[PDB]
Design a protein around this ligand. Structure first.
Ligand SMILES: [Ca+2]
Ligand SMILES: [Ca+2]
Ligand SMILES: [Ca+2]
Ligand SMILES: [Ca+2]
Ligand SMILES: [Ca+2]
Ligand SMILES: [Ca+2]
Ligand SMILES: [Ca+2]
Ligand SMILES: [Ca+2]
Ligand SMILES: [Ca+2]
Ligand SMILES: [Ca+2]
Lengths: 325, 325
């Protein structure tokens, strides 16, 4: 028979094969063994069930693994195979309408999306916190931080400069194609998910927001926009292509464990969210860059990430660019 | 301003950055300098114009570069930048309805698609041959050959076996997910474009068709299906995942120059076209495999590639699988 689930298995494979992500959760959950031992846990968006199993292995007495997508059936099988059907219960459907037989001592979730908030489960985690978490209960991870840095994307630089190099390899001048490539690769307002490295970072990364997931008011902040101002000074001479946005989340130490998606840290499946200017801007050592960045819902869809960027490079006028996934 | 041409520049960049392809054309055209010198050329689907310029550099007196996509405007600029506006003429629109002021001595084209015939320009090249090529005129390349081999795709093997290895890395058994991954990754009827290497090839590749582009009847063969029978014997013990299809084209020697897309040869942007069985089949040294493969138009769209596969592995019954891009 033929099936249409290629994309489903690929997404879950990618996440479990992301050792930085999956080991951070394994260890972050285990670091909280004292708080989980003999207690009940809700896993929001449990996927294949692996995190729910990690919670049982950390000593949870009972775990409710809630998953709305088709993969919930595989999670139930995984739980059975690990001998945990008596303690880990897979419940299909969205957490907003699931019926648990009790409130829980902790919520665990891998809820983060590209750019932190694209197609994230954060609103579901917060809904579950309000509805099902006992007073004083634990959230894992507990917090998130957002970072921005100006970038000179070496891969993009190569793509833009490719056309001017055709002559040296094939004896045909194609340098005129550079303007075309620039318009096409940079003159749009889409957020681009791409992995960078430290070599691409043009100034010290700046933290522009911190989200304490248990804090009052966070749901309203998400609707109004999460963001802040930033300022920095460039390391050296390079074409500025725009900005990269990334995040980290923190698991309480029960030394806290941080799962980072920085280009300076080991690669993850989240990569970074890139915000390209319409064309490169030359900068030099100590060129000042300032601005404001805000992560917003889209009008049609609160889970489609919009980023509004205001930026000022050196003595140039401040500019605005409104991006979306 | 914002533009929507990211995909356009990416496709042309990929093709020109494919040195195996682009150098094969450069050299194949130059190898035919005696036949091109002082003569006229039609370039079918000229793209950015680079091949038309190669023809002028080989000594063509005049080149008509026909291109229907938006990129024709860039080609005109490239021609001007290389000082060739007097000799290379860019004509927008499909070659089927272009008006040339003369018949031509040669047609050059990079017309090949994935699996040779997916979204290929072959029918346009043949239409132009009939309408515009002088009797006795030259086609570059002159011929194509199609190959098939059984494969044990090492990357696929890793993806399928991933689930059974989760326990050894995270201490959670996910071996039950293997059946799910198999159905999802192999239990469909889509042709998959993927690059393999010699390590993936399970028996001697077999040539199953040869197309002489000037030959009478080729248009009718394309409609009825291009293909043939094959037989081979496996090198060793491995999971058979299916078959790979690839091609080469040949430029007359003016030693002919061959541009190959074999997994045993340097990588190209065409990769190979993979035809997966619904599930792996164990084979051993000297396991006989035979079958028939036919490349066909789709009902809705003659340029959407269909491949009909009949295959018999060892003593198993012959099976059929009908694939499409
Ligand atoms: Ca996730
Ligand atoms: Ca990348
Ligand atoms: Ca700050
Ligand atoms: Ca703020
Ligand atoms: Ca989407
Ligand atoms: Ca092509
Ligand atoms: Ca590949
Ligand atoms: Ca044959
Ligand atoms: Ca035949
Ligand atoms: Ca298509």
């Amino acid at each position: 028979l033929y099936y249409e689930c290629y994309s489903d298995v690929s997404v879950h494979e990618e996440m479990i094969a992301d050792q930085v992500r999956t080991e951070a959760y394994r260890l972050g959950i285990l670091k909280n063994w004292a708080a989980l031992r003999g207690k009940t846990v809700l896993d929001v968006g449990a996927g294949t069930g692996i995190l729910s199993i990690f919670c049982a292995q950390a000593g949870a007495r009972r775990v409710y693994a809630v998953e709305a997508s088709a993969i919930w059936q595989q999670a139930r099988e995984v739980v059975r195979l690990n001998g945990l059907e008596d303690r880990v219960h897979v419940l299909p459907g969205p957490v907003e309408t699931v019926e648990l037989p009790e409130r829980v001592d902790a919520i665990v979730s891998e809820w983060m999306g590209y750019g932190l908030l694209h197609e994230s489960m954060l609103s579901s985690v917060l809904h579950a916190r309000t509805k099902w978490l006992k007073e004083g209960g634990l959230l894992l991870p507990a917090s998130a931080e957002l970072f921005v840095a100006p970038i000179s994307d070496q891969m993009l630089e190569w793509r833009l400069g490719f056309w001017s190099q055709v002559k040296q390899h094939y004896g045909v001048d194609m340098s005129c194609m550079e303007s075309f490539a620039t318009r096409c690769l940079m003159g749009h307002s889409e957020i681009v998910v791409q992995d960078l490295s430290g070599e691409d970072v043009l100034a010290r990364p700046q933290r522009f927001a911190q989200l304490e997931l248990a804090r009052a008011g966070l749901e309203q902040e998400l609707e109004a926009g999460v963001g802040g101002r930033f300022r920095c000074s460039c390391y050296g001479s390079a074409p500025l292509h725009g900005f990269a946005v990334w995040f980290q989340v923190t698991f309480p130490g029960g030394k806290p464990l941080v799962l980072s998606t920085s280009p300076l840290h080991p690669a993850t499946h989240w990569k970074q969210a890139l915000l390209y200017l319409n064309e490169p801007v030359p900068v030099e050592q100590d060129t000042d860059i300032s601005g404001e960045i805000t992560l917003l819902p889209s009008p049609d869809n609160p889970r489609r990430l919009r980023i509004l960027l205001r930026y000022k490079v050196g003595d140039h006028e401040e500019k605005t660019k409104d991006f979306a996934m």
